[model samples]
Structures are given as C-alpha cells and as structure tokens.
Target: SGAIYVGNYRVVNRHLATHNDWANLVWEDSSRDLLVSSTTAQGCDTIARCDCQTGVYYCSSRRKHYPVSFSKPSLIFVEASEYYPARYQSHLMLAVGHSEPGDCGGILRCQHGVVGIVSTGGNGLVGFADVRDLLWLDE
Candidate 1:
C-alpha cells in the first residue's frame, strides 16, 4: 500500500555500496539522455526510523517513501533503497543534480555548478533541484 511501479528496471548495480560510495547505479539504455516528467512527489519512504531523522513524503499511492519543492534548488539524497535500515545509515548520499524526480538513481546529469546553482542563487547552495552537495553529505 505504499509504492508505485511507475517505471521498471533491473537493478544494474554491481553491489550495494554505502550512499557515499556512489559506486554502482541503475543501468539502462544510455541512448535516452533526455526525458520528461509530470514533476511532483510527496511519499512516505523511510522505515524502522523516526520521522524527525529523515524525510517523509507520499510520492506514490502507498510507496513507503518521497521529496517536494516550495521554490527551487539542487541537492539529492536517495529516498528509496534496501529492505533493511541499519544499511540506511550509510545509504544517505548526495549529487550535483537530477533532471527530475523520476530520473531514478546514479551519478546524475552533471550540472554547470554555477549557472544553475549560482544564477538561481536560490540558496547560494542548491543548483535548482535535487543536486545540492551539502544537504546529503552526512557526518
């Protein structure tokens, strides 16, 4: 009662690495570099954890997890991963940006680092979406 099979893919990762590793990622046809999205989410994604520690959105019909934006900025952390929680501690990671929420996981689309993150100056931090570096960089 908390997930949507909106898209499908085979977990192309070589192995499960901590969120910081950014080693493995979702493997798909590299041909489709461009994509579009309806653009919105609010799903409850965390489990075995307290609400105050992590994010809590309902992006799917009942998918246990999610993200949203009041304005704009780029900083990312994976909301979906692993059936276990202890691993979740290390699963938190960051990136430069993702084209959209549905873009799925990986190294990200690579941002210009300034024009998007600076020009917007939305926070003199986030580029404009889910790629802000500091937000996901855990201690």
Candidate 2:
C-alpha cells in the first residue's frame, strides 16, 4: 500500500505575480520541527520549517524564509489513489524543442507559465505527450 502526503494550505496573500502561492502548510506530527521542502509545478521550490512550539509551519520560497505562520498545525495523509480533479486531460502530443546528444530533455510551452510535459525520442527533440492529462499542483 502506498500513501501520498497532502498538506492543508491557507492562502495568506492573494496577490498574484508575487505573493500568489504564499500560504501556511500543515503536515504530520513527525513533520513538525523537521525541515521540509517541496518543489512547485511552477519550478520554484517551497521550503518550510515546522515549529511545535507555536503549532504552525513557517514556510517560504526563494531567499525569503519564515515569512508567515499557518493557522492549522495538524497533518493529514491521503491515499495515493485519491481522485483529484484536473483542468485538462487528453492525448495530444507536442514537440517543444530539441536538445544535444547528451542533454536529457527540454521545456515545452503550455497555456500556463509552467511547463507541463517533456517527451523524448521521435526525432530526438524533447516533447510533451498528452497535454490534457496534466494536473495542477496548486490552482
């Protein structure tokens, strides 16, 4: 049985382009007091420190750390088979760009600012298969 971890996030700032994704994350008890970091779909890595003293997780991205505190401090674990709704799902394949012989992959342009898929082979350029089958990390 596989278990996937999900965090309850409270949006502190709703301002887009800068403080859009900023929120307080609540994870597990063991996650408290542990240095944790999760990479976002937008390519930025979010880092947080759980402090049991205040029962709030301090999280931030980029060079900014400990920007805000979360209201909830409890951790919730969900099944890996959980059904989450996505914006789109299909079997559309697109060739984004090419790479060198040793280069693993390149980025593909999607509707969003983030790149959703990367495919290889078939002329050797990295491409994306199934643009509809993409999922949003935070929406």
Candidate 3:
C-alpha cells in the first residue's frame, strides 16, 4: 500500500499515468467548496451524517479514481456522542455518510488532502478508516 498510497492512504489507479490519464477519466471536480467548511458536522449530532456524507461525495468522489467499493449506506458517519467513548485500539476517525436511499461512501479530505474513507454510521456516528493504522493492518 505504500508505493501507491497517498495522504490518508487514498489510492490513485493511474499506474504511471501522465497526461494519458485524462483520456480515460471519470470524474473531474469538487462540485461543492463549502461542504468541507460547513458547520453542519461540527454540530456533533447524528442528524448531520447526511450533511457530511453529501459533502464528501460532492467534494471527494473516491470511486471515480480508486478501487473503493460502493453500496447504499456502505459507509456512514455516526458522530461519537455522549453514549460513545474513545476506542482503545480500534484506530478510526469520523468522515461522512448519506441519509439518502443509496450508497454514499467517498473520500473525506482535510484542506484538500484525504483524511479517511467514508464509512460506518448506521446506528449513529460516522467511522473513518484512518490510513495511519489502516496501512499497519496489512503489515
């Protein structure tokens, strides 16, 4: 995963791609700029899962250039709340998840850099697969 892994370990399937990559492209841009800066997620409420997930999809469409799979609500962003506590070893972070009736997993970015993959959040709270330890998983 190192040779191809990038910030937050997002995979880019361009394989020595140069300008030729544009010839075989899928996505082309971040449709929403404020989605990342939006305060919807900071609210710290499970209700915001859809808000955040929508942003991630519009901003970071990972499925477009990576091997990440897609399934309705495959990844959810359930906020860690008063009922939840920090994990002891299950390294993770909160990304985003949609409330719509379809898959919404995508890339979560921090200042234009990938931070994690959109996953978890069914019951409540989104789970981000932090690449920090995620890479270690394969080690």
Candidate 4:
C-alpha cells in the first residue's frame, strides 16, 4: 500500500480516478482556465468486494489501491484540516460511488473536489481534488 501526493495533499486509502466523461465535458469549457497535472492511484484502507450471488457488496480488506486523476495544480494544505465547503451554485459535484454506501464515496470540498473513500470511520484523507481545475482535454 502506498500514498499519492497531489501537490502537497497526501492521498491515501481511496481509489481516485478520472470521471472521464464528466471530466471531458468540463475540459471543453474554454472560458475557464484548466489543466491536467497528473493521473495516478493511492492506497486505500479498505478493499471493495462484491457478493456475486447476492449482488451485495462489502469492504473487508485494507490498503487497496485507488486511482486518482488530477486536472489542476493544487498545493497541499495541511492547515485546512478538512475539505472546504461546497459552493453548489458555482461548482459541479460529480456522483462517484460503488455498490454500497460508504464503500466508495466522495464529498464536496477542496475547491470543488471531494474527499474520496476512506475507511468506514472516514479517518483518513484518502482522496482530494480541485474540480474547477481537474479535467480531461484529450482521449
């Protein structure tokens, strides 16, 4: 298991990936200034597993890897303590989830980004983003 350093933010315990479809749409907005800084994965504290028979899901393991794609250059800020409040009217928050609640998740914060999935208790800073700056301009 490992951690992904997004600028200065330490992303651990979540599978962060590009919401490619949404990202692509966002990137096309030439009016706003944007750029893709990096694409990578971070080690999560929980492993997502599904019950093929029941179609249910659960998180049982720890230190699983999660994909993370960043579209902007964000400096990590430890003083912030947590994600900034969501500005609903101005930012578009994407719905990124998995089989069950708390399994894989995202919260509105970090300059329009989210605090991606962590453990059940949500004790980690596994994922973070600045959605206003994150986008996919190319295939």
Candidate 5:
C-alpha cells in the first residue's frame, strides 16, 4: 500500500429538535436531503421529500405502480393527536401522501384544526405509515 487515507464529512445541525419521528433517511452527494421512502398497500413506494431543484424519485414494485417523481419543495411528517373531549381510541386515522388504489384509506383524530381523512382502499385514501397531521370530519 502506498499510503493510507481516510475521508469523511461532518454535518452539525443547530436548533435541532429531538426529531426521532422519521423511519429512516439517507443523504446523497447530489446536494439534497432525502426524507425517506414510503410504501402503501396500493403497491406504491414514494419518496417523502427532495431538494427544490432536484426532484425525488419513487418506484413501484408492481407494473401497475410506476416510478414517480415529485417537485414538492419540502416534505414533512404530519403528526396527529386526539382531542380529549372525544373518544380518540374509537376513531380511525390515515397517513397522507400515499395513494390509495382499490379500497383502502387512512383515519385519525385531532382536537383543534382539521384532521386528515384516510380511506382504507374504498375511497381514494390510504392508511398511515408515519405520523401525519390531523384533519377532522364526520365519518
């Protein structure tokens, strides 16, 4: 061996919140931060976020669902919390971002603000994969 060398890059995040909210994330050398890939029952996997300039890519295993890309500037996890006045446990919830195909969707609860609506393959909604924001409506 002529010589030994080591290389690495360190990224320090300030104002960091204890954000263990993501399932997993990977960074690329292409000047972008990847949020993570999400898979829905409809047989589609989509990347949560991407750089404003460079688009993110999501690939589907089945022929039905093809590889898709989105130009969404920011991808964030929408977390939902239940309202104390109502039966939180009694309600169903859904994770946004994922596309529903046949007959599936998402359901969840919230006290203030509109909770998200997810249909379980019946409507055009999908189930929750990660914590997403809540929007409320009568079932």
Candidate 6:
C-alpha cells in the first residue's frame, strides 16, 4: 500500500503552491510604509474528528479561506509557548499548514506583513517579519 499516485502528487503540489502564493502576496506588500503584525491564538490546541470516519480536523489559527481549499490535511500548532494579543482591528490570513518533513502544514500572515511559517517541531510559530517595524495598512 505504498503506492503514490500522480493525482495525489498534483494535489499536494498545488497546495504547496497555494501557500507559496500567499507568501508572495505578503512579500509584494512588504515594501509598504505601514505594516503591523499579529497572530490568532484561538484554535491552537483544539482538534475535530468525524463521528464515524477516520478523518480528523485539527484546530489551527490558520483558517481556510472561503474560496481557497486546495490544502486539505490540517493540524494543530501544539507547541504554543507564547501569546500575542490581536490588535483592535487586525486581520489574520491563514496561508499554509505546517506538516511533516519540516514543512509548515499551516501558514498565516498579519495585515502588517508578519509572515509566520508554522514550525514542524512542537507546532511553534516562527516568522519572517519584525513587529517593531510593522505598520498595519488600511483595507
């Protein structure tokens, strides 16, 4: 049962690309003057499984976009050690998932452009932006 089909491969590749795309979006906006940063602490340690099926829903701060659903397999960022309060009118965008083999099965970016890639170990969150220089842009 170790057969890896092309369809699955394509789907996984697409999912990865979706995450990468989000990253690109944020990067493109990084040059803006006002970019603030924040993260969602909710749904970090929660889990959801089906009543009769082996399928499961792992809680994640990264919520699936209403239109984007190419990434299926989800997980919880269990190794959460710190909490950053969300701003008064901040926006959290779920971009990817931090999964096995040292990849973020879930990913998210703050309106300020703090790109957080979920860590594979302990489900901790790491970043590509500094909040001190972050300035939130108007929607």
Quick one: best lDDT, which candidate? 3
Q: Which ten residues in a row have the lowest lDDT in candidate 1?
A: 114-123
User: Residue by residue across 1-139, what tens digits does model 2's lDDT show?
Assistant: 0011223222111111122322323221111111112324233322222221111111111122121111222223311222222223123232323332222122222223322222222353232222112232243
Worst 10 residues of 4 by lDDT: 48-57
Q: Model 2: how far is 78 from its true place, Å?
A: 33
lDDT of all the models against the reference?
A: 0.22, 0.23, 0.30, 0.26, 0.21, 0.24
> Against the hidden true structure, what lDDT does model 4 obtain?
0.26
* Pairs clashing within candidate 4: 8-76, 13-43, 13-44, 13-45, 15-66, 16-67, 16-68
Candidates by lDDT, descending order: 3, 4, 6, 2, 1, 5
Question: Candidate 4, residues 72-129: lDDT per residue as tens digits?
Answer: 2223322221322222211121222222223433322322223232222223323222
Q: Any runs in candidate 6 off by more than 4 Å, and if so which? A: 1-105, 123-139
- Looking at model 5, report the run of 10 residues with the lowest lDDT sum: 1-10
Error of 1 at 44 (Å): 34
Clashes of each: 28, 6, 10, 7, 33, 15
Error of 6 at 118 (Å): 1.4
lDDT by residue (tens digit), candidate 5, 67-122:
22222222333233221221122122332233533211122223221122222212
Q: What is the C-alpha RMSD of each candidate to the true structure, in Å?
A: 16.3, 18.8, 16.4, 14.1, 17.6, 16.3
53: Cα error in model 2, Å: 50
RMSD of 4: 14.1
For model 3, the superposed segments whose C-alpha errors exceed 4 Å read 1-89, 95-105, 132-139
lDDT of 3 by residue, 1-139 (tens): 1112332222222222235334433322121100111111122111122212222432242223222222232223334434334323133444334322122334444333344444344533344433322233122
lDDT of 5: 0.21
Residue 130 Cα positional deviation in candidate 1, in Å, after optimal superposition: 3.7
**89: Cα error in model 4, Å:** 9.2
TM-score of each: 0.17, 0.26, 0.29, 0.18, 0.17, 0.18
Candidate 1 regions exceeding 4 Å error are 1-15, 18-82, 85-104, 110-131, 135-139
